Design an enzyme around this catalytic site. Structure first.
Site, PDB file in Angstrom:
ATOM      1  N   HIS A 127       0.568  -1.444   0.127  1.00 43.37           N
ATOM      2  CA  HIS A 127       0.021  -0.396   0.126  1.00 43.37           C
ATOM      3  C   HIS A 127       0.636   1.597  -0.076  1.00 43.37           C
ATOM      4  CE1 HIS A 127      -3.578  -2.417   1.058  1.00 43.37           C
ATOM      5  NE2 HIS A 127      -2.815  -3.004   1.729  1.00 43.37           N
ATOM      6  N   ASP A 133      -1.371   9.056  -1.011  1.00 38.96           N
ATOM      7  CA  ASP A 133      -0.766  10.279  -2.368  1.00 38.96           C
ATOM      8  C   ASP A 133      -2.180  11.480  -2.082  1.00 38.96           C
ATOM      9  OD1 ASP A 133      -1.936  11.990  -4.785  1.00 38.96           O
ATOM     10  OD2 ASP A 133      -1.806   9.980  -5.987  1.00 38.96           O
ATOM     11  N   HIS A 171      -4.164  14.966  -2.656  1.00 39.66           N
ATOM     12  CA  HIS A 171      -3.939  15.152  -3.340  1.00 39.66           C
ATOM     13  C   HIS A 171      -3.411  16.963  -2.763  1.00 39.66           C
ATOM     14  CE1 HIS A 171      -7.360  13.307  -6.555  1.00 39.66           C
ATOM     15  NE2 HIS A 171      -5.867  12.384  -5.763  1.00 39.66           N
ATOM     16  N   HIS A 207      -5.224   9.238  -1.255  1.00 42.19           N
ATOM     17  CA  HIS A 207      -5.745   8.173  -1.260  1.00 42.19           C
ATOM     18  C   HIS A 207      -4.663   7.004  -1.741  1.00 42.19           C
ATOM     19  CE1 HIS A 207      -5.182   8.498  -5.828  1.00 42.19           C
ATOM     20  NE2 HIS A 207      -5.686   9.293  -5.660  1.00 42.19           N
ATOM     21  N   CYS A 208      -5.000   5.461  -1.907  1.00 49.53           N
ATOM     22  CA  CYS A 208      -3.475   4.883  -1.688  1.00 49.53           C
ATOM     23  C   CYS A 208      -3.420   4.430  -3.133  1.00 49.53           C
ATOM     24  CB  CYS A 208      -4.422   3.631  -1.290  1.00 49.53           C
ATOM     25  SG  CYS A 208      -3.019   2.210  -1.812  1.00 49.53           S
ATOM     26  N   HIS A 234      -7.121  -0.665  -5.586  1.00 50.81           N
ATOM     27  CA  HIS A 234      -6.928  -0.437  -4.170  1.00 50.81           C
ATOM     28  C   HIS A 234      -8.305   1.391  -3.196  1.00 50.81           C
ATOM     29  CE1 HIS A 234      -3.562  -2.435  -2.405  1.00 50.81           C
ATOM     30  NE2 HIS A 234      -3.586  -2.540  -3.673  1.00 50.81           N
ATOM     31  N   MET A 282      -9.558   2.872   0.043  1.00 52.91           N
ATOM     32  CA  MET A 282      -8.699   2.722   0.747  1.00 52.91           C
ATOM     33  C   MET A 282      -8.643   4.563   0.364  1.00 52.91           C
ATOM     34  SD  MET A 282      -5.615   0.226   0.786  1.00 52.91           S
ATOM     35  CE  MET A 282      -4.320   1.591   2.036  1.00 52.91           C
ATOM     36  N   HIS A 319     -26.792  17.474  -2.226  1.00 54.79           N
ATOM     37  CA  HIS A 319     -27.999  17.763  -1.947  1.00 54.79           C
ATOM     38  C   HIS A 319     -28.473  17.507  -0.372  1.00 54.79           C
ATOM     39  CE1 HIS A 319     -31.910  19.920  -2.952  1.00 54.79           C
ATOM     40  NE2 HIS A 319     -32.222  18.555  -2.143  1.00 54.79           N
ATOM     41  N   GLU A 373     -28.560  24.789  -4.394  1.00 54.60           N
ATOM     42  CA  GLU A 373     -29.725  23.642  -4.165  1.00 54.60           C
ATOM     43  C   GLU A 373     -28.412  22.827  -4.033  1.00 54.60           C
ATOM     44  OE1 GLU A 373     -32.782  22.609  -7.355  1.00 54.60           O
ATOM     45  OE2 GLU A 373     -31.366  23.664  -8.859  1.00 54.60           O
ATOM     46  N   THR A 374     -28.043  22.102  -5.148  1.00 52.93           N
ATOM     47  CA  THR A 374     -27.483  20.993  -5.119  1.00 52.93           C
ATOM     48  C   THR A 374     -25.805  21.264  -6.003  1.00 52.93           C
ATOM     49  OG1 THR A 374     -29.210  19.469  -5.872  1.00 52.93           O
ATOM     50  CG2 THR A 374     -27.475  18.798  -6.648  1.00 52.93           C
ATOM     51  N   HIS A 380     -28.214  13.533  -5.575  1.00 53.99           N
ATOM     52  CA  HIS A 380     -29.203  13.188  -6.690  1.00 53.99           C
ATOM     53  C   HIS A 380     -29.354  13.204  -7.347  1.00 53.99           C
ATOM     54  CE1 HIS A 380     -33.033  15.200  -6.827  1.00 53.99           C
ATOM     55  NE2 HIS A 380     -33.200  15.828  -5.546  1.00 53.99           N
TER      56      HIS A 380
HETATM   57 CU   LIG Z   1      -3.940   0.345  -0.608  1.00 52.80          CU
HETATM   58 CU   LIG Z   2     -34.648  16.858  -4.587  1.00 56.22          CU
HETATM   59 CU   LIG Z   3      -5.470  11.261  -7.061  1.00 58.83          CU
END
Ligand SMILES: [Cu+2]
Ligand SMILES: [Cu+2]
Ligand SMILES: [Cu+2]
Ligand SMILES: [Cu+2]
Ligand SMILES: [Cu+2]
Ligand SMILES: [Cu+2]
Lengths: 341, 341, 341
Positions: free
Chosen positions: B88, B91, B93, B128-129, B139, B144, B249, B273-274, B300
């Site tokens: 494993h 990373d 971001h 994330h892995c 993964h 992960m 939402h 709204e969303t 939604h």
């Molecule tokens: Cu992993």
């Molecule tokens: Cu709705």
């Molecule tokens: Cu990424």
């Protein structure tokens, strides 16, 4: 504590048209009264005549556009006639509380209910049925969705202190449909929504629509039902999608001012090619037409647009502007002295 | 050249809760020390008891939320106990260089590694892995992934020079899952992640999840594990999706201030709204609750929300505001003198 | 009324490179002359050697990037040699009128056409073939799409009155492909585009690509064809997708300035992890590299990136900055006195 404001009854009209309204108003807050009547019915959804067990507000997909102003109260009478088979309700994404009104509007066939909500949020918003559980997506993708627009009292602006005014408004409701097929690949027909449900849920679970349509059916807004405009008109195009994303594009035009998340407290983006309606929302675009002719208005998954139903047309009258675009040389045979490798 | 800053060890807590932290701080930069322990284990993912060969940071889907401030250093001890079967890594971001740290953190079972990254970018971010090649998506969609929040030292603001402060914070990690089915349509069970891999990759390739869940399983944040709030509280809802888009939402509410791309150097949008979480990102929404009751927090695509697992609840205590919304007339039989056509 | 401006012929280059151009210019408006030659041909699209009946502008997927300035006229000679089998045309999302030019450019094999359009809208924009009806999506997803960039005459800016200048530019065209499979799951080969059509349309209708590639094939921009840069360079990454959404991410980096809707009249967003290219558009991101090494540039549906083809690499030369990131302790056995539960 009784709410002592003037009352105004609004007569809704079928999409893609919009009931008469004012953009800017100096009227104070009113109680704006609307009625929505649920109708369950079989409808035709494509050019080959495929039928579908639809569920609608006011008989249309989408449901009609409601227009009010910031600070108005919206008093909705929702009616579920006894000819219908299912309970229904309504959730306004414009409203605050009680699941958008859904938790105060569940009505059996033979009943009606009256909901009031204060229009405290500006923008265009989805409304939809949401009875509970798996019935929520099923009622929505069966057609039970529309939109409401809450204008600022001063009308639209560009977010930089300049008024924007439309000459025309259209409401484009986009609908993802999930129609079962038989072993041979043909669309299945059913005698009731309940009979269609189990097979429909199986298609819904794979999240791939069989049809993606504007105004309830493939070709609804082409041919004789193309949308009219004129060169020089500023046209507001409201687009909603209650369940699934869309990427609107006006072929041969632009979005001059676009609220892709649909909320007029945010400045619009300028000069877009294609915008994005997140599923569960409405957005809006202004465009001033500069050229006559046919325009195609699509979701720019072109497979959806050309092959699943999601194309509308504008027919625009006026004079062609050869400065903006011209055919310098019409199609001709490639010159014999040409290379081209 | 040794980095001579104060060190602060943080004890992570399981989502959807968040470790204690300050919003605004006058502390200078620190080295903030976190530990993440990989755990491969079978987990239950839906209300019917379907199991799944999961891979996690700290035993949860999502991994826990880490919170630091702009200019802090983040020193992460990643541990891969020898009971695990797979290599494993991690990373961030939020981090600059070496594939987000993945190229400096690959550990076999029985190993650990220590990575430091400077928090130079404000916002919420996915971690994330990402071991390499086809193992990267596998993964991630096996669980992960989590998120990190890098607050400005002055806390959040509205992008117009006004401070925003939350009363409560929740982290909603959304997970797309790809569970194989047998010939009869039933979900398959496996004795190890490796044994599940080939069948799982086939489902992954068709890009349609079988399950879309918050906090690792359908119903995780409903019932007794609903999210609590009170009328008047400003609640920050962090939403991440490491592999696939989402459209959050809050049913019966709004996003008062939303950073849908998740980065606090950008002003938030107002009154949504969303909103839209692009796969591979985190976003965040503030909302001040105005009404008591149950709220449902969904993606939604309502099919995803109701039928694939992606619904959470808020239970909000306080007094109902009949000005914002009221049931003017409860459900009643349609008057005999009514029309409605 | 003859247009009396200077003419400048541009020689296009194959993506991901870009023809020579000026960012800021004090030249006035010009008629910028481009030629695009349609080529229908079988192409290799993945690392296993799968072939595909492609249709291209200028022999490449994507078609080449065109670069002009605001106020220029763009005079395009579109050529359809007689070795091709199909009619073709071109729609510029940058242009106003006649379906973007499609309604003025339909040419049979053996013909050419000359279209002029005024570059009145700044940004990056898709161009694509669109012959009519179901041929529109089919030509686009067969490879007939590229992009055009319309720079402001003063070059790019941050939306806050500061000039932005790139040291390098790359054009990443992303292509969704729909390749039929036989009963055993193997990709089918065809002797012509027409022979592939019926089987291809069936795959297209289910809206799930078999391949998602940059520069026309899996691995096109990895290995020896990785994209070069240096620490300190500001790199503009133009990304287009003519038919389907994408979520670009630079692994180990950020988007310093991102126009995800792609239009330079809008201020860019700052410090993004992942951005969103709505299908039917181009967007652009600037990033100043701060660390040497390999970066992977992906769509952050990691299944698409690792398993369907959608990964590019940057190889960045320079000196590692241990302040931004460092490996504090290399992989080592977990200490015997450790807990970790
Ligand atoms: Cu992993
Ligand atoms: Cu709705
Ligand atoms: Cu990424
Ligand atoms: Cu209903
Ligand atoms: Cu073509
Ligand atoms: Cu187009």
């Amino acid at each position: 504590d009784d709410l002592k404001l003037p009352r105004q009854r609004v007569d809704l009209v079928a999409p893609p048209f919009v009931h008469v309204h004012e953009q800017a108003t100096k009227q104070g807050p009113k109680i704006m009264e609307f009625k929505l009547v649920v109708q369950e019915k079989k409808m035709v959804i494509d050019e080959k005549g495929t039928t579908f067990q639809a569920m609608t507000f006011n008989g249309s997909m989408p449901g009609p556009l409601m227009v009010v102003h910031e600070g108005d109260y919206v008093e909705v009478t929702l009616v579920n006639p006894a000819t219908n088979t299912m309970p229904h309700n309504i959730d306004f994404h414009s409203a605050t509380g009680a699941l958008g009104g859904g938790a105060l509007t569940l009505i059996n066939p033979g009943e009606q209910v009256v909901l009031r909500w204060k229009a405290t949020r500006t923008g265009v918003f989805v409304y939809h049925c949401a009875p509970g559980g798996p019935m929520i997506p099923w009622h929505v993708v069966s057609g039970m969705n529309g939109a409401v627009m809450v204008l600022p009292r001063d009308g639209l602006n560009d977010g930089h202190g300049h008024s924007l005014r439309y000459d025309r408004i259209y409401y484009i409701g986009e609908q993802d449909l999930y129609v079962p097929r038989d072993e041979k690949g043909n669309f299945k027909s059913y005698d009731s929504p309940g009979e269609a449900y189990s097979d429909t849920e199986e298609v819904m679970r794979k999240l791939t629509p069989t049809h993606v349509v504007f105004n309830g059916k493939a070709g609804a807004l082409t041919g004789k039902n193309a949308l009219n405009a004129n060169v020089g008109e500023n046209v507001l195009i409201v687009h909603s999608q209650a369940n699934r994303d869309s990427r609107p594009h006006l072929i041969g035009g632009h979005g001059d001012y676009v609220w892709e998340t649909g909320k007029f407290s945010n400045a619009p983006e300028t000069g877009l090619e294609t915008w994005f309606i997140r599923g569960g929302s409405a957005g809006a675009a202004l465009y001033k037409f500069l050229q006559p002719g046919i325009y195609a208005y699509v979701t720019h998954n072109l497979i959806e647009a050309a092959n699943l139903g999601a194309t509308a047309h504008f027919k625009v009258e006026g004079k062609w502007n050869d400065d903006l675009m011209t055919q310098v040389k019409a199609p001709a045979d490639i010159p014999t002295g040409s290379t081209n490798e």
